[PDB]
Write an enzyme that holds these catalytic residues in place. Structure first.
Site, short mmCIF file in Angstrom:
data_model
loop_
_atom_site.label_atom_id
_atom_site.label_comp_id
_atom_site.label_asym_id
_atom_site.label_seq_id
_atom_site.Cartn_x
_atom_site.Cartn_y
_atom_site.Cartn_z
NE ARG A 39 -3.07 1.22 3.27
CZ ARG A 39 -4.10 1.21 4.11
NH1 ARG A 39 -5.31 1.33 3.67
NH2 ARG A 39 -3.90 1.10 5.40
CD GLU B 169 -9.16 4.93 1.72
OE1 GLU B 169 -9.46 4.08 2.58
OE2 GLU B 169 -7.99 5.17 1.37
CG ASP C 71 -9.25 7.10 5.31
OD1 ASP C 71 -9.05 8.14 5.99
OD2 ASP C 71 -8.32 6.34 4.96
CG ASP D 74 -6.10 2.92 10.64
OD1 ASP D 74 -7.09 3.67 10.83
OD2 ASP D 74 -6.10 2.09 9.72
MG LIG Z 1 -6.41 4.40 3.41
#
Ligand SMILES: [Mg+2]
Ligand SMILES: [Mg+2]
Length: 728
Positions: A343, A435, A463, A634
């Site tokens: 990612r 997102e 998100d 996160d």
């Molecule tokens: Mg993300």
């Protein structure tokens, strides 16, 4: 001198020396690409694409400002959906639906295109976590059951420190029930097995009553390890996923089992996303080299870590493939490891690991694409002891994109990276996070922009909620955070993603995926609830740990996802008008106690995450909420919580003095929760001088100023401030 990075001149670039040397001495050797070729090409890509990147960000800012102004010009009036949607169309936010097409992606590995199962996401900065995730393709079901709350400790079934047979017998019984469901016998129950063996090419199960039976569907049996008459393992398949019944009558568990069974080994984390984004803290060239070096170890197969287990020490490494004998004497090999994606960060941030010819910081997403693709050449050209792709692809997740022009920019970036590296066109595949609102409401066009690279779409729902709050910041006060899951928009958002995925031909070429289970110790709850993800037609969904991958794999044996997709492909598509329904609180007449619980819970979640990010560079932490539930946090959960508090502040639900008082009070709670950590330093009582506390305060009190509510600008600034002051 403030933030120090030693750089050297590389053509027109200024490159941090630590990064220059890492690339030249560690990443480059073995790729067949010379450093000169790489750096000259990198500079060309930077010079061509950085101005386009900046203009894309300016367009985000322009659109948010017009939306802010639209709501402001209508203060106190009832929401006029028809006028709002004409406005979003006229300004270029809501675009015409893309014309029909089918994705054209080729050369996709089976774990993505042709299988349904769990997808693990781990911070690549933690080599131990990365190694365990690589190896989580195969997981012990007995360990996952014994070690979690799937099995109650009631009735003297405590885990303890050894092997509690009272508990172990419950584990065994749960696993036998799974075997009866996933690999039913023609007669009887696996509970009564006395022997598993292979005869005349078929699995034979002897039963306590003295008879023998086969499988109801004998084709589920594939192969075995050891002697056919007394195998050490029997390999079965169901819904495309494998599992082994492991047999050892001399083992501690096996000797308690009538058939000698010691475990059931589940094919589990089919794929893993090695994360460089929301679960890591990496703010300078030193941090980014650590990230890239672990990705390099994965791509060369030599990632290794010493670990102390038992009294001694051993070296943890990436597992090999698994070899079995078929009854006809041929050999069957299964992939031993999870298929890896990386990612990259998204389009927002820059860093000073590289400066361009004008002295400006270079976009971090452009850097990640260059460096992680260069490193992946070790897999592509076989310069590795642990192959990843068997099809000549690299799988890059690109997060936080807003709309189809930003998807086209990723497509352009990936093509330019390929040209620098001499890679065949479309080698670099993209996992598209869905997102951000401008992507959701234009999703078909976003997929179309990368239609020959797409390998997934996934609903990063946290998100997405953060973007939802920031986008309508000026509209009014939003509902409490726990109320979001029931709002109209979010169900339509989830269904839209599946509907578009199916309509654009992703089946058979890519994954349609869903979000993360964020309660790492609530595994019984995960088993109950996360079956909803395969039932929604997603052929993957995110889990936080190898243990959770082993358990979530059970769901794919209860639901045939591809058959479910065939059914869902017929339903009426989700409505953009539902997605455009802003989650505003009908009124703000919450009880004072309700408000306090919402503010305190968000303040604790913010602080518990931020203190570890800033002081320890940890990008993913388990943080108890005000109910003492351990939540995996996160940056996406920080985005929601900080934006919600900023929104309630902006609309007078709470006062600044109120939010500040709650942050100070919950900081003390957080300090206590961490008091047993010798590397922890408390925030209280000097809040004014505490970098982490000030970072939390800035994200809340200046939440309205953060671009699309993103948390990285503040976190990066404050982490670097902390590192500099402490010599880190
Ligand atoms: Mg993300
Ligand atoms: Mg493998």
């Amino acid at each position: 001198a403030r933030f120090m990075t030693e750089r050297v001149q590389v053509g027109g670039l200024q490159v941090a020396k630590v990064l220059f040397d890492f690339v030249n001495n560690e990443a480059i050797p073995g790729t067949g690409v010379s450093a000169d070729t790489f750096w000259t090409g990198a500079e060309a890509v930077i010079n061509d694409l950085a101005p386009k990147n900046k203009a894309l960000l300016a367009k985000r800012d322009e659109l948010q400002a017009k939306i802010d102004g639209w709501h402001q010009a209508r203060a106190g009036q009832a929401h006029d959906a028809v006028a709002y949607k004409a406005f979003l169309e006229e300004i270029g936010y809501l675009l015409p639906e893309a014309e029909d097409f089918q994705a054209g992606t080729q050369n996709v590995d089976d774990e993505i295109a042709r299988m349904a199962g769990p997808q693990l996401v781990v911070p690549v900065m933690n080599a131990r976590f990365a190694l365990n995730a690589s190896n989580a393709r195969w997981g012990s079901l007995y360990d996952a059951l014994y070690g979690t709350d799937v099995i109650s400790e009631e009735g003297g079934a405590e885990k303890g420190k050894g092997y509690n047979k009272v508990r172990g017998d419950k584990v065994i019984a749960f696993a036998r029930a799974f075997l009866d469901e996933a690999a039913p016998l023609e007669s009887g129950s696996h509970v009564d097995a006395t022997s598993y063996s292979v005869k005349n090419g078929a699995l034979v199960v002897a039963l306590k009553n003295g008879s023998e039976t086969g499988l109801k569907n004998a084709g589920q049996f594939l192969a075995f390890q050891g002697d056919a008459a007394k195998p050490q393992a029997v390999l079965l398949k169901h819904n495309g996923l494998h599992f082994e019944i492991q047999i050892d009558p001399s083992s501690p568990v096996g000797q308690t089992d009538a058939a000698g069974v010691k475990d059931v080994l589940m094919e589990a984390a089919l794929t893993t996303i090695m994360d460089c984004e929301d679960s890591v803290a990496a703010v300078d060239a030193d941090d980014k080299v650590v990230i890239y070096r672990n990705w390099l170890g994965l791509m060369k197969g030599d990632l290794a870590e010493e670990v102390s287990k038992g009294g001694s020490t051993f070296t943890r490494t990436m597992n090999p493939d698994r070899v079995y004998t078929r009854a006809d004497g041929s050999e069957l090999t299964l992939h031993g490891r999870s298929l890896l994606f990386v990612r990259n960060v998204g389009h927002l941030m820059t860093n000073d690991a590289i400066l361009d010819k004008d002295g400006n910081e270079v976009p971090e997403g452009i850097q990640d694409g260059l460096f992680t693709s260069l490193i992946a050449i070790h897999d592509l050209n076989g310069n590795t002891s642990r192959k990843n792709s068997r099809t000549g692809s690299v799988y890059i997740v690109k997060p936080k994109m807003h709309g189809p022009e930003e998807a086209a920019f990723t497509n352009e970036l990936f093509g330019r990276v390929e040209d620098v590296l001499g890679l065949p066109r479309n080698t670099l595949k993209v996992g598209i996070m869905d997102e951000e609102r401008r992507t959701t409401v234009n999703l078909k066009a976003c997929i179309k922009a990368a239609k020959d690279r797409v390998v997934f779409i996934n609903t990063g729902f946290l998100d997405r909620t953060g973007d939802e709050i920031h986008t309508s910041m000026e509209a009014g006060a939003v509902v409490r955070k726990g109320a979001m899951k029931s709002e109209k928009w979010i169900g339509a958002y989830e269904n839209n993603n599946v509907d578009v995925g199916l309509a654009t031909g992703l089946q058979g070429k890519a994954q349609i995926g869903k979000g993360m289970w964020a309660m790492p110790d609530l595994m019984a709850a995960m088993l109950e609830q996360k079956i909803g993800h395969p039932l929604a037609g997603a052929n993957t969904a995110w889990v936080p740990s190898p243990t959770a991958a082993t358990l979530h794999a059970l769901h794919y044996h209860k639901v045939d996802v591809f058959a479910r997709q065939a059914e869902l492909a017929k339903r009426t598509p989700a409505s953009v008008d539902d997605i455009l329904t802003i989650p505003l609180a009908p009124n703000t007449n919450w009880t004072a106690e309700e408000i306090k619980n919402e503010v305190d819970n968000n303040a604790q979640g913010i602080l518990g995450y931020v203190v570890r990010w800033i002081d320890q560079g940890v990008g993913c932490s388990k943080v108890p909420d005000i109910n003492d539930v351990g939540l995996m946090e996160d940056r996406a959960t920080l985005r929601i919580s900080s934006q919600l508090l900023a929104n309630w502040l902006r609309h007078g639900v709470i006062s600044q003095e109120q939010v500040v008082e709650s942050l100070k009070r919950m900081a003390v709670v957080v300090d206590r929760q961490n008091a047993s950590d010798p590397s922890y330093r408390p925030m209280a009582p000097n809040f004014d001088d505490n970098v982490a506390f000030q970072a939390a305060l800035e994200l809340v009190v200046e939440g309205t100023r953060q671009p699309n509510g993103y948390t990285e600008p503040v976190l990066h600034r404050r982490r670097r401030e902390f590192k500099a002051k402490n010599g880190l």
